Amino acid sequence: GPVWRKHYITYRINNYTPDMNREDVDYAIRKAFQVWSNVTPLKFSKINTGMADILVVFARGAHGDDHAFDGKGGILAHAFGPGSGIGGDAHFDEDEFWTTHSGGTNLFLTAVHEIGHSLGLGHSSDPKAVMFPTYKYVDINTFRLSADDIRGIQSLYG
Ligand SMILES: COc1ccc(CCS(=O)(=O)NCC(=O)NO)cc1
Ligand SMILES: [Ca+2]
Ligand SMILES: [Ca+2]
Ligand SMILES: [Ca+2]
Ligand SMILES: [Zn+2]
Ligand SMILES: [Zn+2]
């Protein structure tokens, strides 16, 4: 499928969920990115202005693509694969309740999953993998990518 063909990649948080403190959304998204840079040659940067490769968006219902959101539960988030414009963009369902912990939907673990997509990974059938399609909360201090995840992204990059 598509990969990014360059090492320096940008992201930009477009708008912030009301559910969390600002610095907490910044930190969840930054930490999620680091999970992928730790196993690839890529370098990520947050830019606050203008066009970014990966636009991080909180939205609800119909929000301008063809992957309409479905109220609370169901579709937690989605993302598009590498490419320009909407390519790489990750959208988070604001009808969910975003958290740092386990009440509601953990933003950090969802963003790790979505960035997986943003970078060109499809889903894995391995339950152990972050790219498995079902959300399950684990203490984010204990989160590690499965060997499956590592084997997929290193197939794509580096
Ligand atoms: C292991 O951690 C996670 C695994 C999956 C999910 C998202 C599940 S989803 O939104 O309900 N399914 C849509 C989808 O695949 N969009 O990307 C979040 C975290
Ligand atoms: Ca939903
Ligand atoms: Ca984009
Ligand atoms: Ca919300
Ligand atoms: Zn969308
Ligand atoms: Zn997914």
CATH number reported for the structural domain that contains residue 7 in this entry? 3.40.390.10
For residue 112, report the distance from its CA to the centre of ligand 1, in Å: 10
Per-residue b or e along 133-151, where b marks 16 or more CB atoms closer than 10 Å to that residue's CB: eeeeeeebeebebbebbee
Reading the block at residue 5, the tokens are 């063909």
| DSSP character string of 3-55 | --SSSEEEEEE-S--TTS-HHHHHHHHHHHHHHHHTTSS-EEEE-SSS--SEE
Report the candidate in 147, 148, 155, 91 with the shortest Cα–Cα distance to residue 118: 91
Beta bridge partners of 58: 92
How wide is the angle at C-alpha 24 spanned by C-alphas 113 and 101, nearest 5°? 65
State the total domains in the chain.
Answer: 1
Backbone discontinuities in the chain, residue before each (C to N > 2.5 A): none
Q: Is the CB of 113 under 6 A from ligand 1?
A: yes
Report the candidate in 45, 50, 48 with the shortest Cα–Cα distance to residue 6: 45
- State the helix-helix crossing angle for 107-118 and 22-37, rounded to 10 degrees: 50
Catalytic residues: 114
Q: Are 85 and 121 in contact (CB under 8 A)?
A: no
Reading the block at residue 78, the tokens are 């989605």
Q: Is 130 exposed, middle or buried (0-12, 13-18, 19+ CB in 10 A)?
A: buried
Determine if residue 101 is labeled as part of a ligand binding site.
no
Q: Is the CB of 12 under 6 A from ligand 1?
A: no
Task: State the residue range of the domain holding 31.
Answer: 1-158
Total residue count of the chain as it appears in this document: 158
Q: Which residue has the tokens 């909407």?
A: 86
Report the candidate in 42, 22, 59 with the shortest Cα–Cα distance to residue 116: 42
Ligand 1, atom 1, lies closest to the CA of: 130
Q: Are 92 and 58 in contact (CB under 8 A)?
A: yes
Rounded Cα distance between 46 and 18, Å, is: 20
3-state secondary structure of 150: helix
Rounded Cα distance between 142 and 106, Å, is: 14
Q: Is 26 exposed, middle or buried (0-12, 13-18, 19+ CB in 10 A)?
A: middle
Mutating to test ligand 1, I would choose from 72, 109, 115, 135 the residue with most ligand atoms within 8 A of its C-beta, which is: 135
